[PDB]
Design a protein around this nucleic acid. Sequence first.
DNA 1: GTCGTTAGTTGTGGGACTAAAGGATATCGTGAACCGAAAAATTAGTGTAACGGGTATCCCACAACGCTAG
Length: 122
Amino acid sequence: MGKSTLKHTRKIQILIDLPTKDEKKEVMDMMYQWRDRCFRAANIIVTHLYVQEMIKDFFYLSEGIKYKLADEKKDEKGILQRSRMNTTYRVVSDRFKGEMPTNILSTLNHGLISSFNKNRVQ
DNA sequence: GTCGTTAGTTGTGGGACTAAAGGATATCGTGAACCGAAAAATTAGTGTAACGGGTATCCCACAACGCTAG
């Protein structure tokens, strides 16, 4: 069956449901920290998904090697030790865990790794 | 005999002359010379290119997951 839906987005205002000011402020500061960690994360993922392609290019300029993004346990020419999205998610979680939730990391990882493969041509 | 009055001319001046349509004209004669006025035309003079961050907008492409284990 075809897609019988069209994606849509709505803006819902939310207040923090706490009695006192200090708890609300603690939650709001935690969420601002979440913002900062998310942006630093996005930077880390994009750098870490740039570098390896240029390592591929380096090897190809060395001996025309056909190195490709795949787990070496599943590919002879693979260099990665796991799935690429897992590599970015790991290299961001190992540093930013315990401060902001990991679902933000997973969503950001998917959102950037999906687009970067399309941007490979450019 | 003479002077004002009245009526009847007599000459002279001012005012009329359907309605409807249409509706073209041609218009001489010559004396000079200098000064002033304003309206017009010609001429003389000055010139950019990219750059730093930071941020307002545009076009243009893509995303907006699903499953398993502690």
